[PDB]
C-alpha cells in the first residue's frame, strides 16, 4: 500500500512554470462556475485531493497515511469540543482540547531531539494545517463559532492552494468568503490580480531566488567554511544573500498561493508588505510572514497578556508586556523546530522587541524632558528615519543567519 503511493505520479506544488498549465486547466471550470454564482462541491474536493496527493507522493509518499490519520484525529477532537461547548464551558477542558489538537505537531517537532529521526505522524503541510485546526478550538471557546458542517471544516482546514506552507487562515473569515461568491466584476478583478501575482512569483522564485539561493549562496558558504573562526567576511556575505533568498523564495511562493486561491474564488490573507523598508522591529512583524505573525499576535500574544493581567502576576505594566513578547516569539521559534538556532532566532526577536519597545517609551519621555526644560522636540527627519531603517535591516538580516542554521556548520562541525 505504501509502495503503491510511491509508484504514484508526483508534482511538487509550484515547482516549475509548466505546473500552472495543469492547475490552470483543472481550476478553469471552478472559475467559470463562479461567474454564474455556483460551486461544484464534489469537483472542488476531487481536484483538491488530487493536487494535495500529488504534492505528497514523493519518495516519502507514506506521509499520505500520516495525513489520513491527522484528518481523523482532528475530526474527533474538534467535534469533541463542539459537542462539549454547547452545554458547559471550562478552562481546562479547552486547554486539553487545545493540547490534543496540537499534539501531533508537538510530536513531529519533539521527535528528532529524542530520536535523531522523523515522526511517523509527519506530513508536509502539518505545521500550517495545525493553525487552522486550533483556530476552531479557540473560536468555539470565545463563543464566536457555533454552527459548522464537516464539509465546511474540511474545506477550510485542508484548503488546496495554502496546504504545504501557504498563508495561515481563520475559520470565520474563510467560511464567510467561501459562503458568498464575489460578484461578476470583483471576480474579474481577482483574475487580473491572479495573473499579476503569477508574473511576480515567476520573477521572485524562478529568477531572483535562483540567483541568491543556488548561484551566490553555495560558494559563499564554501568559502566561509574554509575561512573558519566565529565570523568572517564571507559569513557577512551569506547573511545578506540567504536573507534575500529566504524572502524571495517565500514571498514568491506566497504570491502563487494567493493567485491559485483567487482562481478558487476566495482571497487568502497576504504574507508580505515591503518588509525591508520597515523602520521598526514592531513594524517588521507587520510586514514579514504576516499571516503567521498576525496569528501569533491574536492567538498567542494577546491571549497571554490577558492571563498575566487577569492574575496580575508581574509588578508593572511593561514587564507583563515584555514577558509576553519573549514567550510569544520563543513559542514561534519552537514552531520552526526544536534546534538551538530556531530557539535562538526566537529569543533574538524577543529581546529585540523589548529593546525596541523600551526605546519608544524612552523617546516619548525624553521629548517631555526637553519640552518642559525649554528645548524643541528631538529631531525626526529623513536621516533619523533612514538610520532606523538601517539598524532594523541589519538586525533582521543577522536573525536570518541564525535562522538559516549555517552558524551550526561554522561553529560546531568539528
Amino acid at each position: 500500500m505504501i509502495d503503491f503511493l510511491k509508484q504514484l505520479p508526483h508534482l511538487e506544488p509550484y515547482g516549475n512554470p509548466f505546473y500552472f498549465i495543469y492547475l490552470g486547466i483543472a481550476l478553469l471550470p471552478i472559475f467559470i462556475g463562479l461567474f454564474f454564482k455556483k460551486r461544484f462541491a464534489i469537483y472542488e474536493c476531487l481536484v483538491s485531493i488530487t493536487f494535495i496527493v500529488l504534492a505528497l507522493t514523493g519518495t516519502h509518499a507514506s506521509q499520505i497515511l500520516a495525513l489520513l490519520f491527522y484528518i481523523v484525529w482532528q475530526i474527533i477532537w474538534v467535534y469533541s469540543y463542539k459537542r462539549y461547548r454547547s452545554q458547559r464551558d471550562n478552562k481546562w477542558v479547552f486547554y486539553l482540547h487545545s493540547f490534543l489538537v496540537v499534539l501531533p505537531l508537538i510530536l513531529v517537532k519533539v521527535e528528532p531531539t529524542i530520536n535523531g529521526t522523523q515522526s511517523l505522524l509527519n506530513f508536509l503541510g502539518i505545521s500550517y494545517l495545525t493553525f487552522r485546526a486550533v483556530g476552531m478550538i479557540i473560536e468555539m471557546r470565545d463563543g464566536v463559532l457555533k454552527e459548522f458542517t464537516l464539509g465546511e471544516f474540511l474545506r477550510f482546514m485542508l484548503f488546496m492552494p495554502t496546504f504545504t506552507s501557504g498563508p495561515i487562515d481563520r475559520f470565520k473569515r474563510f467560511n464567510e468568503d467561501y459562503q458568498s461568491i464575489p460578484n461578476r466584476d470583483e471576480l474579474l478583478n481577482m483574475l487580473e490580480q491572479a495573473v499579476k501575482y503569477i508574473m511576480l512569483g515567476f520573477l521572485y522564485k524562478f529568477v531572483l531566488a535562483q540567483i541568491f539561493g543556488s548561484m551566490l549562496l553555495p560558494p559563499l558558504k564554501a568559502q566561509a567554511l574554509s575561512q573558519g573562526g566565529i565570523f568572517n567576511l564571507p559569513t557577512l556575505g551569506v547573511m545578506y544573500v540567504y536573507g534575500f533568498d529566504l524572502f524571495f523564495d517565500f514571498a514568491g511562493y506566497s504570491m502563487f498561493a494567493l493567485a491559485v486561491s483567487n482562481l478558487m474564488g476566495i482571497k487568502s490573507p497576504i504574507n508580505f508588505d515591503k518588509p525591508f523598508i520597515s523602520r521598526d522591529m514592531k513594524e517588521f512583524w507587520n510586514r514579514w510572514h504576516m499571516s503567521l505573525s498576525f496569528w501569533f499576535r491574536d492567538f498567542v500574544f494577546m491571549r497571554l497578556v490577558i492571563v498575566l493581567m487577569r492574575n496580575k502576576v508581574f509588578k508593572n505594566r511593561n514587564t507583563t508586556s515584555n514577558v509576553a513578547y519573549i514567550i510569544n516569539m520563543m513559542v514561534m521559534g519552537f514552531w520552526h523546530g526544536i534546534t538551538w538556532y530556531y530557539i535562538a532566532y526566537g529569543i533574538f526577536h524577543g529581546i529585540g522587541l523589548v529593546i525596541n519597545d523600551a526605546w519608544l517609551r524612552k523617546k516619548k519621555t525624553i521629548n517631555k524632558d526637553r519640552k518642559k526644560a525649554g528645548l524643541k522636540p528631538l529631531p525626526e527627519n529623513k536621516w533619523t528615519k533612514a538610520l532606523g531603517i538601517f539598524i532594523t535591516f541589519n538586525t533582521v538580516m543577522l536573525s536570518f543567519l541564525i535562522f538559516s542554521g549555517f552558524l551550526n556548520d561554522l561553529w560546531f562541525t568539528k
Partner: protein
Amino acid sequence: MDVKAEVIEIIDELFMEDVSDMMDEDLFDAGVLDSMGTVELIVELESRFDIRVPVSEFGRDDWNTANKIVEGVTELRNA
C-alpha cells in the same frame, strides 16, 4: 444600571479623561489607549460586566470608538 453610563465611568478611572459628550472619537488616535492600555481596559470590562471579551476576533475597525464599545457590550450581555 445603565450600560452607557458605566463604560463612560470606567474609561476615566484607569486613563483619567471623560469622553461622554465627544464620544465617536477613535480612542487609539485620541491618545486614550496604549498598545498595552487596551488589555488593561478588557480586564476591567470583564470584572465589571461579567462578560468574557473575544480578543482573537477583535479587528482594528471593530471596537475602536466608545459607541461601538457600549453597543458591543450589550450584544454580548444577552445575545
